[PDB]
Design a protein around this ligand. Structure first.
Ligand SMILES: *[C@@H]1O[C@H](CO)[C@@H](O[C@@H]2O[C@H](CO)[C@@H](O)[C@H](O)[C@H]2NC(C)=O)[C@H](O)[C@H]1NC(C)=O
Ligand SMILES: *[C@@H]1O[C@H](CO)[C@@H](O)[C@H](O)[C@H]1NC(C)=O
Ligand SMILES: *[C@@H]1O[C@H](CO)[C@@H](O)[C@H](O)[C@H]1NC(C)=O
Ligand SMILES: *[C@@H]1O[C@H](CO)[C@@H](O)[C@H](O)[C@H]1NC(C)=O
Ligand SMILES: *[C@@H]1O[C@H](CO)[C@@H](O)[C@H](O)[C@H]1NC(C)=O
Ligand SMILES: [Cl-]
Ligand code: NA
Ligand code: NA
Length: 1274
């Protein structure tokens, strides 16, 4: 008995079971058929006759839910038989796929993806017109959501930009249809950091015994891509002879080495020889060890027998072929020898055809017992394999062969061939996961039988056919696709049969259905190497084209289950060609594209979906390699300093078939570069070196930098009189001795009626520039992504990537600007900033100072409300997430209305509880009040809070606290607001000479800014002008303020004030008059913001600015001080000591820092340490060791190409916070200027210390190679 039914069930689909009775003992068999959280109880008493099928239908109930289903076939009466099967329930009529242009991404990287949705017929579902897509980071924060992602030919495409410092780990793309997940897919975001490098060892040519040697390519590369310089020790072990061959060589990224054997004579035709390669990186001495077995072969080819079937049939033809291949897998053509099969007196002396085959058609007579297939070549090579005759018990097969085309409403003709003379065999036909048709066929004791079937409508456009018989006591089968060619999407893609060359172009030719969508994608096997463990897309889409994925079960894949008698067995860089295109009118489209300039192997893929004909795929992915004939690779330090002698090291690579002299030319761009030993007027320096094939060859230039700023490193290389070239345009940052702290003096004017005014300015080597700006946000908008000259790696500081964008948009909307480029810029960075800020969200829904830590009341109020506000401008903000944060915040409020700090105290004046919590309480209320939605949904917190302030008001004596309380009261319309502001005013200071008013607290920018906001609420515009005069003049060179909260409150205050006092239109002339000459500026456009009017005064003493007209403007002077680098401390003690490493290339620097407590002030605010390195040094993977545990480093930030390390602390007291930093000398630099370490209080940078340190001095005479060693040496 053979029972076959589908394994999958659906709501309405008729479920057809088939029972085939081939038992010749009885003449009928009686069966019971159960079919069952049991939401089904359908039974069927049923009768199957001898030598016949019986097809039993089952109407599925429309109201099926997910559950556990079974089907049970029981043999009633005198026939024992119990079989059972699990039926998997399907809720969907559709399936989904996600394609992603890469498996792994880096930080500043765009993810591109497509969502493909197809119905049972593999076409776009007509019912489904849009899907619900959501992407979330490794901690499940929603980062982008498409609620109605429209399909086009079943496909939805889009992208996500990963942030500059994003959340690392596994992201999840998730697709939903009608609130039910259809498909999800992960991708990874990793950091290249992994300064560890990979080593590879492979033979450069297939080793043959006659060579008496092995030639090896050794290759060492960092994961990002650059070559590694080191010494490779190569060992090769011959254990039969207790021998060992050694060789050492310096490898610059890639090298070759030949190892010669003495008397190598293998016993067999092959022999594995183990090899070990120890690769020691140059200065670090970081060792990586790589091993492999390397086969030596006697012959350049190998043979295997390829048979039509495993055994041959006694009296029938037997087709097979001897397949010749080289040991790299490729076909081996033209190999000659002599085949003979003596059992048949067969013989042929030929050579392997163009596919490496020698095809054979042997003819065993019925007497023939076996076929001994020998092959012998005159080189001594021989290959023998025996084929045995079919034994029914273990070897019997049945095969199916389509004999006619498969057209709709025509017959389908098949030749069923079996090894046995058949009494019966069965067929089944499936389409859309149900059995359409079946039959019990009865050959009259025949090995062949011609099966004919009418193609029905239910088989369109995709069906399959399975045949099966019983031979011996095994069920043998075979199957075939019924692809109705006239109803299918006949998609195909191809490349011209040429060598595809870097930089040149290739012509993609494709064909299919006119309307059809086409999606193309190419991946380099490199990317597919590091992660092939997870699901490959091409496997996914290929599988959906067919069936459903221990050993290959044909029934599982066909969507079925089979069962039978107990004693019966069954037999057995950037992305490229991510284009979408359409096939057009003539049924073909040619896309033409430029091959990227890189050496790699590609995997090009292409699918196609027609709205009517559905999914179409290419057989296997297209493959080809692109090989740069000649390139050059740089290895430069991130920075150097004026006057230092640096060796710029490069490495050359030649992939042609011969050794060629390369000419490398380093250019002196804009008088930036001195070539040591050559006059200052030279514009270039050319050296030459020979470059063998596939061997890295170094080349270097000794130079000094002449100008601060960015030095262009401009190189050109060529090899055969310029017939092969490569070029590089890179950057080294030339820096000053001491950390330049720029100062900006600014004066603003605001003329309503036509006014003339003259501003004198007294100045005080130090380069200086004047600037005219029509707007507070001009330079801010210009510097939106890099506003501060201070690290910002903590949760509060990171809001500089978020809040300033809001202030910009708040203002651009308030004045109704139509300068779209700006709205676009602020909007985009705001989106990037959301993603970035989520790093600091905590499990409880709050926000903390670090990626993982206790949440902060201050930061949760700051971030939560700020994000609520951001909903105006971007839609990617998770509302539920904001709700959670503000709920966490609200629960922290005391019965009295008071808020206390939570987590670390990083900002004393705000979080401190020395003055009844007035600052923090006022801030939380202020933040909520500033946003109408939050104000509404937490009215209770505001009420209790304002009551608290009302009670504490008499004791509020600190201007910082009072400025926040007052501004909250103004926002709230509290009865005490007028009284609070008056009190605040009473505490104010003035500078009468400068027409300034301000507040002298330890955070005077915040305080004065908060005060100005209240002035603005109270419409005190004239008395506010002196306040603005002061604030405007504390601005950092970018237009922000030098710190974070200073910036957020400061810019809010300045822009708010500006909105109210600024004239309707600008129309003014600024005459800048220095030394003697006079520069002129005119501003007649109000709206305009994007405006340069920079200008460089020389080493000047005084300066005169005459403004005339009407409008608003900022008159700025920027000083670039260059103070001498000198030890200094104020309220911090900082001590450095170099530790003896025993290597000139290793620097172990012990840093110890501590706050100097004084009176009530026992600990600092958040404190950073920055360590800067001497030129040419770089930090290791984890450069910090021997940390003190008392007060741990909360964050380590490595930047500027391992040149700078920033270490963050919650705060310091008089405990000695120590650590040891390890760095290696990666680049040859002489006359090195000293480096330094700084520690400072973040929110009060006046408190800081700096200590200089020097390193052992490399001498110019060691650095240079002989040619350019100057005339002061020997
Ligand atoms: C690449 O595929 C996109 C679909 O993602 C095609 O874009 C659409 O074009 C149709 C009209 O042809 C419009 O209805 C849609 O508005 C477009 N979608 C979007 C979101 O742009 C695009 O035509 C394809 N490109 C090519 C060259 O074939
Ligand atoms: C990704 O999301 C899907 C649902 O969209 C979920 O089933 C799966 O568990 C998630 N992956 C991870 C890494 O948790
Ligand atoms: C092995 O490499 C050496 C050095 O280039 C070369 O001379 C030799 O031809 C190579 N061996 C073979 C068999 O190609
Ligand atoms: C502001 O206060 C600081 C610290 O108390 C003090 O050094 C400074 O003189 C004050 N400035 C003015 C103008 O009062
Ligand atoms: C690396 O090894 C070289 C040579 O053995 C030595 O000169 C140098 O000091 C070593 N560097 C380190 C980091 O130990
Ligand atoms: Cl807090
Ligand atoms: Na001042
Ligand atoms: Na030096």
């Amino acid at each position: 008995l053979l029972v076959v039914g589908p394994k999958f069930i659906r709501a309405n689909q008729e479920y057809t079971l088939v029972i085939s009775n081939f038992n010749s003992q009885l003449s009928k068999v009686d069966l019971l058929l159960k079919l069952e959280l049991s939401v089904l109880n359908v039974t069927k008493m049923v009768d199957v006759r001898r030598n016949m099928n019986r097809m039993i239908n089952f109407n599925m109930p429309e109201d099926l839910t997910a559950g556990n289903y079974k089907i049970t076939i029981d043999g009633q009466r005198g026939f024992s038989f119990h079989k059972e099967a699990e039926l998997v329930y399907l809720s969907k009529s559709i399936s989904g796929l996600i394609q992603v242009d890469k498996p792994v991404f880096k930080p500043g990287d765009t993810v591109n993806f497509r969502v493909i949705v197809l119905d049972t017929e593999l076409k776009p579902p007509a019912r489904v017109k849009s899907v619900y897509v959501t992407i979330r980071d490794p901690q499940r924060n929603v980062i982008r959501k498409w609620s109605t992602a429209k399909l086009y030919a079943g496909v939805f495409e889009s992208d996500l930009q990963i942030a500059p410092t994003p959340m690392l780990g596994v992201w999840n793309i998730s697709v939903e249809v009608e609130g039910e997940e259809l498909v999800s897919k992960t991708f990874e975001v990793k950091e290249y950091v992994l300064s560890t490098f990979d080593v590879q060892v492979m033979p450069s040519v297939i080793p043959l015994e006659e060579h008496q040697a092995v030639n090896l390519t050794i290759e060492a590369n960092y994961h990002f891509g650059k070559p590694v310089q080191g010494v490779a020790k190569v060992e090769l072990y011959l254990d039969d002879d207790k021998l060992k061959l050694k060789k050492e060589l310096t490898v610059y990224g890639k090298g070759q080495v030949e190892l010669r054997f003495d008397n190598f004579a293998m016993d067999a035709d092959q022999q594995d020889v183990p090899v070990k390669v120890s690769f020691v990186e140059q200065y670090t001495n970081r060792t990586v060890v790589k091993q492999s077995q390397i086969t030596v072969y006697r012959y350049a080819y190998r043979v295997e027998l390829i048979k039509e079937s495993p055994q041959f049939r006694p009296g029938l033809p037997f087709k097979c072929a001897l397949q010749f291949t080289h040991h790299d897998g490729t076909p081996a053509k033209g190999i000659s020898g002599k085949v003979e099969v003596s059992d048949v007196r067969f013989e042929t002396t030929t050579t392997s055809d163009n596919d490496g085959l020698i095809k054979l058609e042997l003819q065993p007579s019925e007497g023939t017992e076996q076929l001994s297939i020998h092959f012998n070549a005159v080189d001594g090579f021989f290959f023998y394999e025996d084929v045995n005759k079919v034994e029914t018990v273990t070897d019997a097969y049945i095969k199916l062969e389509l004999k006619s085309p498969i057209k709709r409403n025509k017959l389908m003709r098949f030749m069923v061939t079996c090894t046995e003379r058949m009494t019966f065999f069965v067929y089944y036909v499936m389409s859309k996961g149900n059995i359409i048709d079946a039959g019990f066929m009865r050959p009259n004791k025949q090995p062949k039988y011609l099966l004919q079937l009418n193609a029905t409508e239910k088989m369109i456009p995709r069906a399959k056919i399975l045949i099966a018989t019983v031979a011996g006591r095994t069920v043998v089968y075979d199957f075939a696709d019924l692809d109705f060619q006239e109803l299918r999407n006949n998609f195909d893609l191809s490349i011209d049969e040429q060598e595809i060359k870097p930089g040149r172009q290739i012509e993609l030719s494709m064909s299919g259905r006119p309307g059809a969508y086409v999606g193309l994608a190419a991946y380099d096997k490199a990317l597919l190497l590091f992660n092939k463990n997870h699901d490959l897309f091409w496997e996914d889409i290929g599988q959906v084209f067919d069936g459903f994925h221990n050993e290959f079960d044909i029934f599982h894949s066909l969507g079925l289950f089979a069962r039978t008698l107990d004693d019966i067995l069954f037999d057995s860089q950037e992305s490229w060609l991510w284009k979408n295109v359409s096939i057009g009118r003539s049924g073909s489209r040619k896309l033409i594209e430029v091959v990227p300039d890189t050496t790699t192997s590609w995997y090009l893929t292409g699918f196609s979906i027609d709205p009517v004909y559905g999914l179409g795929i290419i057989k296997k992915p297209i493959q080809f390699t692109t090989v740069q004939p000649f390139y050059i690779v740089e290895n430069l330090p991130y920075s150097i300093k004026r006057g230092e002698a640096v060796v710029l090291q490069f490495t050359l690579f030649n992939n042609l078939g011969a050794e060629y002299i390369a000419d490398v030319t380093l250019y002196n761009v804009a008088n930036q570069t001195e070539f040591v030993g050559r006059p200052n007027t030279d514009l270039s320096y050319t050296k030459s070196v020979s470059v063998p094939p596939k061997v890295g060859v170094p080349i270097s230039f000794l130079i000094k930098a002449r100008k601060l700023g960015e030095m262009a490193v401009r190189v050109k290389a060529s090899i055969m009189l310029g017939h092969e070239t490569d070029a590089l345009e890179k950057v080294i940052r030339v820096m000053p001795e001491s950390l330049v702290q720029p100062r900006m003096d600014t004066r603003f004017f605001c003329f309503d009626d036509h006014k003339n005014q003259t501003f004198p300015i007294n100045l005080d080597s130090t380069k200086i520039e004047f600037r005219l700006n029509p707007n507070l946000l001009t330079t801010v908008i210009k510097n939106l992504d890099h506003l501060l000259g201070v690290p910002t790696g903590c949760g509060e500081q990171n809001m500089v990537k978020f809040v300033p964008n809001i202030l910009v948009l708040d203002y651009l909307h308030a004045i109704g600007s139509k300068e779209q480029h700006l709205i676009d810029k602020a909007t985009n960075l705001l989106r990037q900033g959301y993603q970035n800020q989520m790093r600091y969200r905590q499990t409880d829904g709050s926000f903390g100072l670090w990626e993982t830590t206790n949440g902060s009341v201050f930061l949760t109020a700051f971030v939560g409300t700020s994000m609520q506000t951001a909903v105006k401008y971007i839609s990617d903000i998770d509302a539920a997430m904001v709700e959670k944060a503000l709920d966490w915040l609200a629960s922290k409020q005391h019965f009295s209305g008071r808020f206390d700090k939570a987590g670390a105290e990083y900002h004393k004046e705000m979080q401190g509880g020395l003055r009844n919590g007035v600052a923090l309480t006022s801030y939380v209320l202020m933040a909520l009040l500033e946003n109408d939605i939050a104000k509404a949904k937490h009215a209770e917190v505001i009420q209790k809070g304002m009551t608290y302030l009302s009670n504490q008001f008499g004791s509020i004596n600190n201007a910082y606290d009072l400025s926040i309380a007052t501004y909250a009261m103004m926002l709230n319309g509290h009865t005490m607001k007028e009284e609070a502001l008056n009190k605040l005013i009473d505490m104010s200071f003035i500078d009468a000479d400068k027409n300034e008013r301000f507040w002298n607290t330890t955070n005077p920018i915040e305080t004065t800014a908060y005060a100005l906001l209240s002035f603005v609420m109270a419409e005190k515009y004239t008395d506010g002008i002196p306040v603005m005069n002061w604030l405007v003049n504390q601005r950092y060179v970018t237009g922000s303020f030098p710190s974070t909260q200073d910036t957020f409150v400061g810019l809010k205050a300045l822009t708010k004030m500006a909105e109210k006092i600024s004239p309707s239109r600008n129309d003014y002339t600024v005459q800048l008059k220095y030394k003697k000459s006079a520069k002129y500026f005119k501003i007649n456009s109000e709206q305009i913001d994007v405006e340069n009017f920079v200008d460089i005064p020389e080493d000047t003493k005084k300066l005169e600015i005459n403004v005339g007209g009407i409008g608003f403007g900022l008159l700025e002077v920027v000083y670039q001080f260059n103070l001498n680098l000198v030890n200094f401390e104020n309220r911090f003690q900082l001590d450095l000591e170099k530790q003896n490493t025993g290597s000139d290339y290793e620097l172990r620097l012990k840093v110890c820092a501590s706050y100097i407590p004084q009176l009530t002030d026992r600990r600092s605010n958040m404190a950073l340490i920055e360590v800067t390195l001497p030129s040419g040094y770089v930090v290791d993977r984890n450069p910090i060791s021997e940390q003190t545990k008392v007060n741990p480093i909360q964050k380590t930030e490595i930047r500027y190409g391992g040149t700078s390390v920033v270490l963050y602390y919650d705060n310091m007291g008089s405990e000695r916070n120590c650590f040891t930093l390890t760095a290696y000398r990666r680049f040859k630099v002489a006359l090195k200027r000293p480096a330094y370490v700084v520690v400072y209080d973040y929110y009060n940078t006046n408190l800081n210390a700096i200590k200089v340190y020097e390193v052992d001095k490399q001498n110019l005479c060691e650095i240079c190679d002989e040619e350019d060693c100057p005339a002061e040496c020997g």
